[PDB]
Amino acid sequence: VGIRFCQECNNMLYPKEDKENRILLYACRNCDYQQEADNSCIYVNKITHEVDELTQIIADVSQDPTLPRTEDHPCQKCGHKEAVFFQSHSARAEDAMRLYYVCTAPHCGHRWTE
Amino acid sequence: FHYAGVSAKNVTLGVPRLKELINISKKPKTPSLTVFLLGQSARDAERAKDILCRLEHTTLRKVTANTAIYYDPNPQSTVVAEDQEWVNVYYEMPDFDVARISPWLLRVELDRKHMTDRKLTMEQIAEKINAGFGDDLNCIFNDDNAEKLVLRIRIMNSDENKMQEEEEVVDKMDDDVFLRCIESNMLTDMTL
Amino acid sequence: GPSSQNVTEYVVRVPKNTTKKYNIMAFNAADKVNFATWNQARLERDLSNKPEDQPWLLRVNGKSGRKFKGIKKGGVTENTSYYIFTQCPDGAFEAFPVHNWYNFTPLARHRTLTAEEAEEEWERRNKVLNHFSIMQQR
Amino acid sequence: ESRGFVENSYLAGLTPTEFFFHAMGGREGLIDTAVKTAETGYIQRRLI
Amino acid sequence: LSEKDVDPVRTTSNDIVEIFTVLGIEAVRKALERELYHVISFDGSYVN
Amino acid sequence: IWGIGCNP
Amino acid sequence: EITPDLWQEACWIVISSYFDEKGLVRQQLDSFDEFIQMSVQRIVEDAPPIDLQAEAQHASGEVEEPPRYLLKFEQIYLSKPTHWERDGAPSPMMPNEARLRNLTYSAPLYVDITKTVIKEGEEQLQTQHQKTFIGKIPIMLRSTYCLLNGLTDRDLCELNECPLDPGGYFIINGSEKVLIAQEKMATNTVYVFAKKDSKYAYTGECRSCLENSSRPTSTIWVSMLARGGQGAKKSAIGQRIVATLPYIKQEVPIIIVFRALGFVSDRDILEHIIYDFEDPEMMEMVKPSLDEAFVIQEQNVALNFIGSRGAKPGVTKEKRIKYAKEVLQKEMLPHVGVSDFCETKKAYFLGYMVHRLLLAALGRRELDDRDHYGNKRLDLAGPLLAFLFRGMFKNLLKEVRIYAQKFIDRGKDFNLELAIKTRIIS
Amino acid sequence: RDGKLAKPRQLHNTLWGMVCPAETPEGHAVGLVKNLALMAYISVGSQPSPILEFLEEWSMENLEEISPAAIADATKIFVNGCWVGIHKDPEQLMNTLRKLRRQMDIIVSEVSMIRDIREREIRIYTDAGRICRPLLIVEKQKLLLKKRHIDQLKEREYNNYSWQDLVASGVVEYIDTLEEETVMLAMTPDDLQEKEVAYCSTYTHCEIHPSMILGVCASIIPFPDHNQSPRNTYQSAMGKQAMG
Amino acid sequence: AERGELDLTGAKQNTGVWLVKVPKYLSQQWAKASGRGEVGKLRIAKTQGRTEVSFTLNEDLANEHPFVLQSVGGQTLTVFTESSSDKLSLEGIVVQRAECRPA
Ligand SMILES: [Zn+2]
Ligand SMILES: [Zn+2]
Numbered sequence A: 001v002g003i004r005f006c007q008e009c010n011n012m013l014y015p016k017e018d019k020e021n022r023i024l025l026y027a028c029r030n031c032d033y034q035q036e037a038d039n040s041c042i043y044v045n046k047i048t049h050e051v052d053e054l055t056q057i058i059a060d061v062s063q064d065p066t067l068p069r070t071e072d073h074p075c076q077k078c079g080h081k082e083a084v085f086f087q088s089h090s091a092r093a094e095d096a097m098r099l100y101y102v103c104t105a106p107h108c109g110h111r112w113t114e
Numbered sequence B: 001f002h003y004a005g006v007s008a009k010n011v012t013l014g015v016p017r018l019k020e021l022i023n024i025s026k027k028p029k030t031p032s033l034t035v036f037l038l039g040q041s042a043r044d045a046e047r048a049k050d051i052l053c054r055l056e057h058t059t060l061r062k063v064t065a066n067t068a069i070y071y072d073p074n075p076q077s078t079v080v081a082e083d084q085e086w087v088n089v090y091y092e093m094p095d096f097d098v099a100r101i102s103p104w105l106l107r108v109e110l111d112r113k114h115m116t117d118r119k120l121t122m123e124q125i126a127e128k129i130n131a132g133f134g135d136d137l138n139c140i141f142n143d144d145n146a147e148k149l150v151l152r153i154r155i156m157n158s159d160e161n162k163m164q165e166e167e168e169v170v171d172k173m174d175d176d177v178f179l180r181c182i183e184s185n186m187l188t189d190m191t192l
Numbered sequence C: 001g002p003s004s005q006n007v008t009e010y011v012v013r014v015p016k017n018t019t020k021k022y023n024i025m026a027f028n029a030a031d032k033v034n035f036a037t038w039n040q041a042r043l044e045r046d047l048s049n050k051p052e053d054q055p056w057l058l059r060v061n062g063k064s065g066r067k068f069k070g071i072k073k074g075g076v077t078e079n080t081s082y083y084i085f086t087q088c089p090d091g092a093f094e095a096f097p098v099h100n101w102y103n104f105t106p107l108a109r110h111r112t113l114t115a116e117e118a119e120e121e122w123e124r125r126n127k128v129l130n131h132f133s134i135m136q137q138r
Numbered sequence D: 001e002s003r004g005f006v007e008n009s010y011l012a013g014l015t016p017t018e019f020f021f022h023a024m025g026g027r028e029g030l031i032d033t034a035v036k037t038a039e040t041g042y043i044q045r046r047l048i
Numbered sequence E: 001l002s003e004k005d006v007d008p009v010r011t012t013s014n015d016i017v018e019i020f021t022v023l024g025i026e027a028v029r030k031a032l033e034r035e036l037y038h039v040i041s042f043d044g045s046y047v048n
Numbered sequence F: 001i002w003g004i005g006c007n008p
Numbered sequence G: 001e002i003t004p005d006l007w008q009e010a011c012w013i014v015i016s017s018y019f020d021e022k023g024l025v026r027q028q029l030d031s032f033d034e035f036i037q038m039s040v041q042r043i044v045e046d047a048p049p050i051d052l053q054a055e056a057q058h059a060s061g062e063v064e065e066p067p068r069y070l071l072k073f074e075q076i077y078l079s080k081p082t083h084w085e086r087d088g089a090p091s092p093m094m095p096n097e098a099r100l101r102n103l104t105y106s107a108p109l110y111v112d113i114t115k116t117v118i119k120e121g122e123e124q125l126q127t128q129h130q131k132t133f134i135g136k137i138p139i140m141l142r143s144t145y146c147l148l149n150g151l152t153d154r155d156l157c158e159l160n161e162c163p164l165d166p167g168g169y170f171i172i173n174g175s176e177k178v179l180i181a182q183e184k185m186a187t188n189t190v191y192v193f194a195k196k197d198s199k200y201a202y203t204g205e206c207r208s209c210l211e212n213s214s215r216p217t218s219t220i221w222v223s224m225l226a227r228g229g230q231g232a233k234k235s236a237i238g239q240r241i242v243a244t245l246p247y248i249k250q251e252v253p254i255i256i257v258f259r260a261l262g263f264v265s266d267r268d269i270l271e272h273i274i275y276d277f278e279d280p281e282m283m284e285m286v287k288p289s290l291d292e293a294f295v296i297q298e299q300n301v302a303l304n305f306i307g308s309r310g311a312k313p314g315v316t317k318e319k320r321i322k323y324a325k326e327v328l329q330k331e332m333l334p335h336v337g338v339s340d341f342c343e344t345k346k347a348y349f350l351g352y353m354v355h356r357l358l359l360a361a362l363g364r365r366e367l368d369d370r371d372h373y374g375n376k377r378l379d380l381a382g383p384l385l386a387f388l389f390r391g392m393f394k395n396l397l398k399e400v401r402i403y404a405q406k407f408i409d410r411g412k413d414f415n416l417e418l419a420i421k422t423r424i425i426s
Numbered sequence H: 001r002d003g004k005l006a007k008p009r010q011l012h013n014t015l016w017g018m019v020c021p022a023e024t025p026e027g028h029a030v031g032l033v034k035n036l037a038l039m040a041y042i043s044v045g046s047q048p049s050p051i052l053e054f055l056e057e058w059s060m061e062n063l064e065e066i067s068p069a070a071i072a073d074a075t076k077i078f079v080n081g082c083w084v085g086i087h088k089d090p091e092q093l094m095n096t097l098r099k100l101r102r103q104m105d106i107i108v109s110e111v112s113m114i115r116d117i118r119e120r121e122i123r124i125y126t127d128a129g130r131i132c133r134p135l136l137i138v139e140k141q142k143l144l145l146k147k148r149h150i151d152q153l154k155e156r157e158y159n160n161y162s163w164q165d166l167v168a169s170g171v172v173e174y175i176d177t178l179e180e181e182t183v184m185l186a187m188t189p190d191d192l193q194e195k196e197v198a199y200c201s202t203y204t205h206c207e208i209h210p211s212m213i214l215g216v217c218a219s220i221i222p223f224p225d226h227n228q229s230p231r232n233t234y235q236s237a238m239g240k241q242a243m244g
Numbered sequence I: 001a002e003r004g005e006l007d008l009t010g011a012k013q014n015t016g017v018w019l020v021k022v023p024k025y026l027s028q029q030w031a032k033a034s035g036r037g038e039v040g041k042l043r044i045a046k047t048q049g050r051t052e053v054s055f056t057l058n059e060d061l062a063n064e065h066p067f068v069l070q071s072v073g074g075q076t077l078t079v080f081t082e083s084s085s086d087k088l089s090l091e092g093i094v095v096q097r098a099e100c101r102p103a
Helices: A059-063 B015-023 B045-055 B081-092 B113-115 B124-133 B155-162 B177-187 C113-123 C131-136 D017-045 E018-025 E025-041 G005-019 G026-046 G096-102 G153-158 G232-239 G254-261 G266-273 G280-290 G298-307 G315-331 G345-364 G381-410 H047-057 H092-103 H147-154 H165-167 H189-193 H231-241 I009-013 I024-033
Strands: A014-016 A022-026 A035-036 A039-043 A083-086 A102-105 A111-113 B064-071 B104-110 B138-141 B148-152 C005-012 C021-028 C042-047 C056-060 C067-072 C083-087 C092-099 C100-107 G050-052 G068-079 G082-085 G088-093 G106-118 G125-138 G170-172 G175-177 G184-186 G192-195 G200-208 G217-226 G241-244 G376-379 H131-137 H173-177 I016-022 I040-046 I051-057 I065-070 I077-084 I088-100
Touching: A014 C131, A039 B177, A059 A083, A059 A102, A059 H092, A083 G266, B015 D017, B015 E025, B064 B177, B081 B148, B104 B113, B104 B177, B104 G298, B124 B148, B138 G232, B177 G232, C056 C100, C083 I088, C113 G298, D017 H231, E018 E025, G005 H147, G005 H165, G026 G068, G026 G381, G068 G125, G068 G381, G096 G170, G125 G170, G125 G381, G192 G345, G200 G345, G217 G345, G232 G280, G241 G254, G241 G345, G254 G266, G254 G280, G254 G298, G254 G315, G254 G345, G266 G280, G266 G345, G280 G345, G298 G315, H131 H189, H147 H165, H165 H173, H189 I040, I009 I088
Parallel strands: C005 C092, C021 C100, I016 I088
Antiparallel strands: A014 A022, A022 A035, A039 B064, A083 A102, A102 A111, B064 B104, B104 B148, B138 B148, C005 I040, C021 I077, C042 C056, C056 C067, C067 C100, C083 C092, C083 I016, G050 G068, G068 G106, G082 G088, G106 G125, G170 G175, G184 G376, G192 G200, G200 G217, G217 G241, H131 H173, I040 I051, I051 I065, I065 I088, I077 I088
16 A cells, blocks of 8 residues: 555665566565565555545644634543534545534544544 | 526526627537437436436546555455455356456445446446456456445456467566556546 | 662863864664674765865775765854763763764665666656666666 | 624624625625626627 | 437527537527527516 | 625 | 723724824835845845956966956945035935925935955955945935934924825935835745646745845746646556746656755655655655656756756756756755755755645645735835845946956056946936 | 736735725726725834744754654744744744744744644744734733723823833734734624623734724725725725815 | 775774754853863763753853753764874764753
8 A cells, every 4th residue: 555665775666566476576676676565455546535534633723723612522531621623624525514623621632523 | 606596507697608609619618408308207207317317427437436456366365355255256157267367456446325326237337348448357246235346357368378469478568557557547438 | 779860970071172073974764874884984075076165975885885975064053063972981071063064875886877878768758668677678 | 794794784884894795795896897898898899 | 419318309508519510500590599698688688 | 795696 | 900891992092102103104114214224235245246357368478367356345325315416516405395306306325345456466455445426326205314304393394394294205306206015926935726727737836035135036836747638658657746947948857856956765755755654645646756757866867857958958968967956056946045055955845845735636735825915925115126226236236347347458457436337226 | 907807806805904995996907906904014024033043942953854754743933935944842932932022032023923733834924025913912811901001002192102112012913914814803802802602712812993904095984884885995086086 | 994994993882972952152151261171060860760961060161051852763873083184983873862951
């Protein structure tokens, strides 16, 4: 799935089929280094590109004065009442008016979507 | 703007539309076509929906949830755990494996919602892909009852064995690069 | 034991002048620099003009080993200074100002495409054929 | 209120945010008039 | 137009160039008249 | 300045 | 200690204090004031010292062959606005008299010029011409250098000037002219826009300038080519990122630009471009551009690739390489750095530009708005007159150089006073 | 003016408080020629060197070892362009910068500092072109402006207290458009800061008076909120033509 | 053994050195005399699971500086010297980095 680099020149490896043993390899084009492929998957494309934006949401966002917050939804970890909520804030998000929540109070940063 | 929304279709009006008509522009801003239905399909909504599906362009990208390319050394190996069953079924009486099989596997996964909205069939999609591309692309299609709609595409068996090509034994576009080119072509140009 | 509450305090010495100037040699972590194989090295001013205000070239273990290029730090430390503390038998720390900072980056000991052939290859941007075979041909 | 609805009447008097939004609308109308003149003039000349 | 269960008589497009290439110059005469009348009378304005 | 269907 | 429901008095008291200190035209005035002092000195300092020697071919021998003449402009001075009558006696010029007589309200500008001459005998001689008059600068009325400044309303009435007149205008040829602040796009800022009909899906632009010392802008584009174009390899690779570097005829692949900055390894280029290696989407985005630049794997080859596409070709290969290197050090990303080892900083900023383009393509950041007035700056009297004075002072130095070169090729001598043409600046 | 695109002419939201909405010419220059608001000020420019020195003292390690690291080092400190390093703590840096802006040591009133919490960038712009306006400062739900300041300003003459003293005290602050994007404003202290059904409890600033959003010519219009918007533009144009 | 040879003996002995960033007032105080051989004292106090580093300014020099450590795992640093006799040598490898802050 991910990209891995050569251990000699730190260039980009490329996948290559081993014709003898039928085992996927990654070889650097600029040298002779070769490493067997462990993942066995190469090119993955998510056309719907459904990605949980909780991975793209920063905990620091809880410090923004311009964001709305409610005391209705408490946090799961610490049970803090304040929770600052906001929409996708992303282009090409398809159609999503879902509210994402970020817990206020220091260092918790727990994020839930309801 | 401020056009009354009788239908969910925008139309150029006013000075720009007068410009388009007067200039006889080859490219209208909003080219539209009003279609009237001849038979009972006009009265009945389901037949009208069938006509709408027959008249609306649908690419493979529109119904494809996600596409992946796995290097599968053997068809029986079944690197993906899920296909192990249905691959076995198709290889209980294997077809077109006599020449060879491709070591690379394009495991397209289609969204059921889009498929049922467009009323497409796995056999329909597989037939379109296999026939249009030819014997080179061999496709294995899941049962609709299975939770995941999976189409397993492989490159030409005779091209893999290289007995049919003869000529010089030199890889053209490798195989995975060629498979990626095929994937892009299917995504944007299938015209199912 | 004493290690859980040891307190060490040492004298600091700053000599006015040192015969050898002190510099900083910094290697990137991903390069995995190892000094065990450094049997010999050659550090000299570059000849790319084909002196004191020019980058440095390092050639470890002659031509067979890896080569590195080091460039002085462009940002001067007008409001900062760097010192190095070294252990000495007298037990007092000695501080030496950093004359220069150098970041060394390696160059692979791999076959290098000639400029003319590289231009000819770039003329064929749409390299339908495998690039690895092209590199093997060169 | 946030997106531009003005509940006050002209007699009652617009609140400051409503005032700015109203200015935005009036600006759009004025721009439309000014841009319209030239395109319509060119069309009329072509037809004649 | 040639699709099944599509009325050949009344199916029309707004593009006058397509009307030309498919149905002929007289069909374009009528279609251009229809399109101009639509844009003119959408405001409710009447032109003879 | 009125609404979406009116004027600005 | 609060002021509730008494607020209507308080807001207008603080507004009254604001308008009592400043007034309405404080933009113009302040801008001009700043300009004069800072800008003129800076420009006079920033212009290269005049270097000059006689042609070696003209005279035989090397005893006096390089008579190096070096001219340095030390310091600036402005007198109060002054009119020089036909008799020649200087007089203070009141604005009202300038309006009536159709004169220009301007002040003389004097520069200390130090001329150092090396006769190749190592006896370099430095002669300082103090207060050398180089031109006249129109003075904005009621600015710090206007005669009306710091005068009470009674004194203004004695001079037939209105106490209520705001100032902020120049009297040129007896007419009041007002510099109108000119809107412009902000400099040294990366903005990612999308052009619908362009061959690029997204373009990231940075109108870089080095504190407006010179070169008003040096714009550089990093744009991701659209995948709309269909081809076998084109479909396989997808969108590729190209760079429209200044002073280069055509597009340059971005990875080649990174390698020209000395970062050959793909891992390091991606470290500058992709700050988090763990994210797979951005790595997949960057892969095709690496594929495009797989040919060039050396710094010198990349420099030659850049030089070949330069606007003016270089016959020699190493000439092309040196030209590309100097062009990158000066023209590309001038605000980041202009000399020495600013290459790492330029690499980091170019990686930031590519990264911001990638974020816009992935939808993680929104495209910038050109109409957003945060992305806009306003050129007041200061920046406009500063640009003017840059141009005219460079032309003045050029004319001094021409006159000096003639007289030096003669070998007779050179006079600073004759070389300076006050006509130019004035 | 020839361009018929209706995009660059429209009154943008960011023009609030810095360009008069009403006062624009009508014709080929609708929305292309603008006029400053009454309280608007335009930055004159300053040297970025002291700000860079303070940043170096606080932290902002430059030439680091790929430390952004999914922006683990929260925020990248920018200046007028010129990425100058990054910090691990962005909030302490922002608060220290605001305190310095009050004490007027390294940050003149015009220095504009913007932190984008998402995307993790701090911009710190001092580039001689920015248009900014004075806003009162709200700490918790209380305006920093108090009766002492208003009483001293009321006695302005023979008390040697002026607007610059109000700025030095930290009561008011200059905010440009980029900072206006990151600031919670209240139109009025009483109506908005005071506790009610809580719309926002994080107001950071308060408008001195809304009427200052108008320019010179539109400020003579009486009851301008009771007229149609194009009529205020017409009155600005005609008030430039009145005889007096 | 040549002119360009680098004396890697310090690397072989694995001599550990500490790199510290110190302010300009401290460096200028040191450079004022710079020849007395003394500028201050570095005191390190270690506890069960915490260590603190401080520097005390010399009383003559003045007429507390806590040290904050930084991780060095992200970059490998070494110190090399260019002798006036054109004999390059390596002094050691940096094993710890510190910053000096005003009180
Ligand atoms: Zn390699
Ligand atoms: Zn929590």
